[PDB]
Design a protein around this motif. Structure first.
Motif, PDB file in Angstrom:
ATOM      1  N   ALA A   1       0.820  -1.202   0.000  1.00 29.49           N
ATOM      2  CA  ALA A   1       0.000   0.000   0.000  1.00 29.49           C
ATOM      3  C   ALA A   1       0.862   1.263   0.000  1.00 29.49           C
ATOM      4  O   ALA A   1       0.531   2.238  -0.676  1.00 29.49           O
ATOM      5  N   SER A   2       1.963   1.250   0.750  1.00 33.20           N
ATOM      6  CA  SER A   2       2.869   2.407   0.770  1.00 33.20           C
ATOM      7  C   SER A   2       3.467   2.637  -0.602  1.00 33.20           C
ATOM      8  O   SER A   2       3.599   3.768  -1.053  1.00 33.20           O
ATOM      9  N   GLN A   3       3.827   1.543  -1.263  1.00 36.43           N
ATOM     10  CA  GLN A   3       4.335   1.616  -2.620  1.00 36.43           C
ATOM     11  C   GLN A   3       3.271   2.182  -3.564  1.00 36.43           C
ATOM     12  O   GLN A   3       3.570   3.019  -4.402  1.00 36.43           O
ATOM     13  N   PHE A   4       2.022   1.748  -3.407  1.00 37.89           N
ATOM     14  CA  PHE A   4       0.949   2.204  -4.291  1.00 37.89           C
ATOM     15  C   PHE A   4       0.696   3.701  -4.126  1.00 37.89           C
ATOM     16  O   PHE A   4       0.365   4.409  -5.085  1.00 37.89           O
ATOM     17  N   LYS A   5       0.859   4.182  -2.902  1.00 40.33           N
ATOM     18  CA  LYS A   5       0.762   5.609  -2.642  1.00 40.33           C
ATOM     19  C   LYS A   5       1.818   6.359  -3.449  1.00 40.33           C
ATOM     20  O   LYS A   5       1.544   7.422  -3.987  1.00 40.33           O
ATOM     21  N   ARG A   6       3.021   5.803  -3.546  1.00 39.12           N
ATOM     22  CA  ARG A   6       4.056   6.434  -4.366  1.00 39.12           C
ATOM     23  C   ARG A   6       3.678   6.403  -5.844  1.00 39.12           C
ATOM     24  O   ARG A   6       3.979   7.330  -6.573  1.00 39.12           O
ATOM     25  N   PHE A   7       3.019   5.333  -6.281  1.00 42.54           N
ATOM     26  CA  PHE A   7       2.524   5.254  -7.655  1.00 42.54           C
ATOM     27  C   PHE A   7       1.537   6.388  -7.920  1.00 42.54           C
ATOM     28  O   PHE A   7       1.609   7.051  -8.948  1.00 42.54           O
ATOM     29  N   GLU A   8       0.623   6.609  -6.978  1.00 38.12           N
ATOM     30  CA  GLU A   8      -0.362   7.680  -7.077  1.00 38.12           C
ATOM     31  C   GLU A   8       0.333   9.031  -7.217  1.00 38.12           C
ATOM     32  O   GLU A   8       0.004   9.811  -8.105  1.00 38.12           O
ATOM     33  N   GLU A   9       1.285   9.298  -6.327  1.00 31.79           N
ATOM     34  CA  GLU A   9       2.042  10.550  -6.356  1.00 31.79           C
ATOM     35  C   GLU A   9       2.824  10.667  -7.665  1.00 31.79           C
ATOM     36  O   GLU A   9       2.826  11.726  -8.306  1.00 31.79           O
ATOM     37  N   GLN A  10       3.469   9.569  -8.064  1.00 32.25           N
ATOM     38  CA  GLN A  10       4.238   9.538  -9.300  1.00 32.25           C
ATOM     39  C   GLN A  10       3.358   9.881 -10.504  1.00 32.25           C
ATOM     40  O   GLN A  10       3.786  10.583 -11.418  1.00 32.25           O
ATOM     41  N   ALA A  11       2.120   9.394 -10.492  1.00 30.92           N
ATOM     42  CA  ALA A  11       1.202   9.627 -11.603  1.00 30.92           C
ATOM     43  C   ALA A  11       0.846  11.105 -11.717  1.00 30.92           C
ATOM     44  O   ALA A  11       0.882  11.678 -12.808  1.00 30.92           O
ATOM     45  N   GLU A  12       0.504  11.721 -10.591  1.00 26.24           N
ATOM     46  CA  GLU A  12       0.145  13.132 -10.603  1.00 26.24           C
ATOM     47  C   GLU A  12       1.308  13.998 -11.080  1.00 26.24           C
ATOM     48  O   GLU A  12       1.118  14.923 -11.861  1.00 26.24           O
ATOM     49  N   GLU A  13       2.511  13.672 -10.626  1.00 25.31           N
ATOM     50  CA  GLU A  13       3.704  14.414 -11.016  1.00 25.31           C
ATOM     51  C   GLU A  13       3.975  14.332 -12.514  1.00 25.31           C
ATOM     52  O   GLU A  13       4.435  15.299 -13.117  1.00 25.31           O
ATOM     53  N   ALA A  14       3.675  13.184 -13.113  1.00 27.24           N
ATOM     54  CA  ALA A  14       3.864  12.998 -14.545  1.00 27.24           C
ATOM     55  C   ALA A  14       2.665  13.528 -15.318  1.00 27.24           C
ATOM     56  O   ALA A  14       2.630  13.475 -16.544  1.00 27.24           O
ATOM     57  N   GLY A  15       1.678  14.035 -14.595  1.00 23.21           N
ATOM     58  CA  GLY A  15       0.492  14.577 -15.228  1.00 23.21           C
ATOM     59  C   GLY A  15      -0.434  13.513 -15.789  1.00 23.21           C
ATOM     60  O   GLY A  15      -1.290  13.806 -16.617  1.00 23.21           O
ATOM     61  N   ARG A  16      -0.271  12.272 -15.346  1.00 20.69           N
ATOM     62  CA  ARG A  16      -1.176  11.213 -15.779  1.00 20.69           C
ATOM     63  C   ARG A  16      -2.357  11.021 -14.838  1.00 20.69           C
ATOM     64  O   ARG A  16      -2.220  11.061 -13.615  1.00 20.69           O
ATOM     65  N   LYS A  17      -3.522  10.810 -15.429  1.00 21.60           N
ATOM     66  CA  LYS A  17      -4.713  10.468 -14.684  1.00 21.60           C
ATOM     67  C   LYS A  17      -4.476   9.121 -14.013  1.00 21.60           C
ATOM     68  O   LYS A  17      -3.819   8.248 -14.579  1.00 21.60           O
ATOM     69  N   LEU A  18      -4.995   8.956 -12.805  1.00 25.96           N
ATOM     70  CA  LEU A  18      -4.890   7.688 -12.108  1.00 25.96           C
ATOM     71  C   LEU A  18      -6.209   6.937 -12.160  1.00 25.96           C
ATOM     72  O   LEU A  18      -7.264   7.506 -11.908  1.00 25.96           O
ATOM     73  N   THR A  19      -6.156   5.655 -12.496  1.00 24.62           N
ATOM     74  CA  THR A  19      -7.351   4.830 -12.393  1.00 24.62           C
ATOM     75  C   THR A  19      -7.111   3.633 -11.476  1.00 24.62           C
ATOM     76  O   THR A  19      -5.978   3.151 -11.350  1.00 24.62           O
ATOM     77  N   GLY A  20      -8.178   3.165 -10.836  1.00 27.94           N
ATOM     78  CA  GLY A  20      -8.078   2.100  -9.857  1.00 27.94           C
ATOM     79  C   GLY A  20      -9.427   1.499  -9.518  1.00 27.94           C
ATOM     80  O   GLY A  20     -10.465   2.136  -9.674  1.00 27.94           O
ATOM     81  N   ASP A  21      -9.407   0.251  -9.070  1.00 28.36           N
ATOM     82  CA  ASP A  21     -10.612  -0.420  -8.619  1.00 28.36           C
ATOM     83  C   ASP A  21     -10.515  -0.612  -7.122  1.00 28.36           C
ATOM     84  O   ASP A  21      -9.890  -1.556  -6.653  1.00 28.36           O
TER      85      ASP A  21
END
Ligand code: HEM
Ligand code: HEM
Ligand SMILES: CNCCN(C)c1cccc(CCc2cc(C)cc(N)n2)c1
Ligand SMILES: CNCCN(C)c1cccc(CCc2cc(C)cc(N)n2)c1
Ligand SMILES: C[C@H](O)[C@H](O)[C@H]1CNc2nc(N)[nH]c(=O)c2N1
Ligand SMILES: C[C@H](O)[C@H](O)[C@H]1CNc2nc(N)[nH]c(=O)c2N1
Ligand SMILES: [Cl-]
Ligand SMILES: [Cl-]
Lengths: 362, 362
Positions: A305-325
């Motif tokens: 989960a901590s890693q996934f939080k970094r994925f979320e942050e990484q996505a916003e920084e790259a300007g990519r929309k995040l999707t998830g279930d």
């Protein structure tokens, strides 16, 4: 209509792919090339660079996956060259070996030739490359109930399981132009298994539990720019809850909680004792400890989960929309102890991606 | 447009209500009566039978509630007669007393006069009738952080908390035609509290944890046939996880897991030890044991889920569509050990129902 869907998906993918690869200038010429190739041939062929990044993008867009932080380090193996069942077999063996990597697991995908007219060149029957057989004879249950139908299909084809609770299914796949699939027994030397012990409860070994090291999903379709790679097995390493809270725990899987409760010395009599919850935790501690003690990669749900939080942050920084279930992202134990539980996610489907496809058995 | 919304909702509700009550024949005449009354007055007044069944239907339709099996036994108290703040206060005191019922908790709703022109007759500020205050002064945190804003608002109005971790907020509500709400300190003799002890770990009492017996939601709007009862507090009994896995556990609530880990004698150093999961289970066992030892009603999440399964079956048998919010229905610990986790639910909004409304503070 089909050539139009293909051309549309190709346009969307090539622009996005080359943009990410800093190759925006090459888009016009490559699209022209693809445009002529679809016209002439009815399809187009990805470059090695396109295929690799496409498989990576597909993982990044997988809504149900908590492990996406490492999307960009996926090891992509290009096997579009295979033509024979011996070559498919050896590619599958190789995938197991290289992904296992002596326990230091490498996220890997092997890509086989794609569908042509929606005609599969290779059709893999296994759900995972390494999975246990399941039997039900007159209310007698052995092994993994989720494998019951595939196991029955294999046994049609002349395979016979030893009817242990942990029979390795053989590899089973069908080639284009064959009416029946073939099957090959897995070499045991290729398959790492981990016996489940507990860090302080010695009796836990009396359960004789074990699980396989590497989950290799082999029945999903990879879609990249309109090309359907129906045969493209991929793997990561396990998150412990997958084994401890589901595979070994579910009533319709191995259903071990009552036996766990007994060996850890608590009663399984009253709901208010939360004996299922206590057993789940100990079994899950056991799984993590066992994988780590053997030197087989695994992650706990908190770290994941901590890693996934970094994925979320990484996505916003790259300007990519995040999707998830959300319903798949939350872990099946202590979900409210993760940040995931406390936010929401857009469940939109973005391509490239991995998709379910129909079982050829059942 | 407003009289039309009202007349439409009234038609839908009266037909469905009287159908359920075996009074289908009376629908035409009652609808006529309502039709004239809306025309003349701008609204209509529910009969006692309509109000009671309406509140029951509203609970039945509450997607996020796992406790709905008992929708039909809700104790409905009709207080549409109140006109003064003394009467509101005494009705709130009475609700606490009768719902608490010496620990043998009765699901109860008290219904105050409804909005007229969207004008509230009574506006309740509390989130629950019984809740703990929260403070944050210079990084110093005391009590329940979720109560911080309401606590600050109360202290504007001349209330002062003792700044214990468990200060009972006073009742606070505003009457129509008053610019400020009034507040009343809760009589301690009305409020049952439960000290948290553990069934085998004596040290658990060193945490000095406690919680209140009865959760009485007091800031939701009840909607029945177009009538907006903005002030209609209701209660059930607790499911243990609400206290053990959330109120006492969340980092933005009481955040007790590190202290739980210490008193139960495990290290809180490594994610792979699953110390948060183990602490969650023990704290949750403690909550259940403590409520039961005191004779205060409570349900564990396993039993609650079993009950909800009966609600599902009961609904199909009565030919009613079932609605639910999967993300709220699953318990925050061991959700995969409940049937809820393994099916899906239609999250459609059906009326009558309970709805969020804007906070008058904040
Ligand atoms: C690196 C370690 C990885 C971890 C720890 C991880 C974790 C997970 C977990 C826990 C799930 C939920 C599965 C379930 O409950 O059955 C999942 C789903 C998924 N993961 Fe990952 N994953 C990893 C790597 C990968 C890779 C390499 C891919 C593909 C390239 C991938 C694609 C997916 C997909 C497609 C799903 C959803 C499958 C479905 O719908 O049934 N993951 N992942
Ligand atoms: C009888 C015992 C009851 C139990 C054990 C129970 C259980 C629960 C639980 C666990 C939740 C989730 C709340 C959260 O996570 O914050 C919930 C939500 C809810 N319950 Fe019940 N409930 C009960 C009675 C009632 C009654 C009597 C009503 C109304 C008449 C009601 C209406 C609701 C509503 C409206 C919600 C959602 C509130 C929101 O959206 O914030 N419940 N219930
Ligand atoms: C409810 N039935 C679920 C069966 N499915 C769809 C299923 C079953 C087992 C596993 C998965 C995906 C699990 C997975 C995949 C990969 C690459 C890594 C990982 N850690 N887990 C999906
Ligand atoms: C994320 N913030 C959540 C705050 N909310 C909306 C909230 C907070 C506390 C409680 C509830 C509903 C809980 C409840 C209500 C009733 C009648 C019974 C019961 N057991 N639980 C809802
Ligand atoms: C945004 C997210 O859905 C949110 O955290 C929800 C999840 N499910 C929940 N379920 C319950 N019972 N209570 C809650 O407060 C929440 N919060
Ligand atoms: C129908 C329901 O959504 C289903 O049980 C889902 C819930 N979330 C899940 N989450 C994960 N990781 N794996 C699953 O198999 C499921 N099953
Ligand atoms: Cl698995
Ligand atoms: Cl609460």
């Amino acid at each position: 209509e089909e050539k139009e869907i293909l051309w549309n998906e190709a346009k969307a993918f090539i622009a996005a792919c080359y943009q990410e690869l800093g190759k925006a200038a090459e888009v016009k010429d490559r699209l022209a090339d693809i445009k002529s190739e679809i016209d002439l041939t009815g399809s187009y062929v990805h470059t090695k660079e396109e295929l690799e990044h496409g498989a990576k993008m597909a993982w990044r867009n997988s809504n149900r996956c908590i492990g996406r932080l490492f999307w960009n380090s996926l090891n992509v193996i290009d096997r579009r060259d295979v033509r024979t069942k011996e070559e498919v077999r050896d590619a599958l063996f190789h995938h197991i070996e290289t992904a296992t990597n002596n326990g230091k697991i490498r996220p890997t995908i092997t890509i086989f030739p794609p569908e042509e007219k929606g005609e599969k060149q290779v059709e893999i029957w296994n759900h995972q490359l390494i999975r246990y057989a399941g039997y039900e004879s007159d209310g007698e249950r052995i092994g993994d109930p989720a494998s019951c139908s595939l196991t029955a299909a294999c046994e049609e084809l002349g395979w016979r399981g030893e009817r242990t609770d942990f029979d390795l299914l053989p590899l089973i796949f069908r080639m284009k132009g064959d009416e029946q699939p073939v099957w090959y027994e897995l070499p045991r030397s290729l398959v790492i298994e981990v016996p489940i012990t507990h860090p302080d409860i010695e009796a836990f070994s009396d359960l004789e539990l074990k699980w396989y090291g590497v989950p290799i999903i082999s029945d999903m379709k990879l879609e990249v720019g309109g090309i359907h790679y129906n045969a493209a097995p991929f793997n990561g390493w396990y998150m412990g809850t997958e084994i401890g809270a589901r595979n070994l725990a579910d009533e319709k899987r191995y259903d071990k909680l009552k036996k766990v409760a007994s060996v850890i010395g608590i009663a399984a009599d009253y709901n208010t004792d939360l004996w299922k919850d206590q057993a789940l935790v100990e079994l899950n501690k056991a799984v993590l400890h066992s994988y780590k003690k053997q030197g087989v990669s695994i992650v706990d749900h908190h770290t994941a989960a901590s890693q996934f939080k970094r994925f979320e942050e990484q996505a916003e920084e790259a300007g990519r929309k995040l999707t998830g279930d959300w319903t798949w992202l939350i872990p099946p134990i202590s979900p409210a102890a993760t940040h995931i539980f406390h936010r929401s996610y857009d469940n939109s489907i973005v391509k490239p991606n991995y998709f379910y496809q129909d079982k050829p058995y059942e």
